[PDB]
Amino acid sequence: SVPTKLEVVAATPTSLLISWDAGHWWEWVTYYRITYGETGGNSPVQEFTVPGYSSTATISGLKPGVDYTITVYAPTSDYGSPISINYRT
């Protein structure tokens, strides 16, 4: 279910601006955690959390040209599967 529609709004070569349909009224969660790492798995994944009232997040400091995998989770898996996406900067 939540979240929905994880899209990259702005995309500087070193920063991705991601938003998501946070849900509604009752399905609003307290915090989202967002994971971004290299798409080849050569490294582990970086990770931050964001207050659950906000539905956007700024992922800064990447490497240009490289494709990335952006994941957005919920506090628990009881809200649904994580909506993971990709983007080449």
Binding site: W25, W26, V29, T30, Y31, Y53, T76
Partner: protein
């Protein structure tokens, strides 16, 4: 008058406690906020009422009206009655309280 802020602080905790059962372990926004909001309002009314009212009359009234108004909500938003031997076990917990406070 201070007995009216008492129940206002009792009922506020009564609500926030039931909103806490709804917050999925503080992982659902709005039920997590409401619990934080309620326990603030139930704290602020407690200060205005125990500012100068005895802290044994206020505790016992809270410990009883609260032991009822949240169990009737737990049973209103669910049920369970006496899952384990006795509901009276909570009625006599409420009794042993009212004698190490008033006696």
């Amino acid at each position: 008058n201070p007995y009216i802020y008492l129940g206002g602080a009792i009922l506020a905790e009564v609500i926030g406690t039931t909103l806490m059962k709804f917050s999925n372990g503080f992982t659902r926004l709005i039920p997590s906020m409401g619990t934080i909001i309620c326990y603030c309002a139930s704290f602020w009314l407690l200060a205005q009422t125990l500012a100068y009212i005895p802290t044994g009359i206020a505790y016992a009234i809270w410990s009883g009206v609260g032991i009822v108004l949240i169990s009737l909500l737990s049973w209103g938003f669910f049920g369970q009655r006496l899952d384990l031997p006795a509901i009276i076990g909570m009625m006599l917990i409420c009794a042993g309280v009212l004698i190490i406070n008033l006696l």
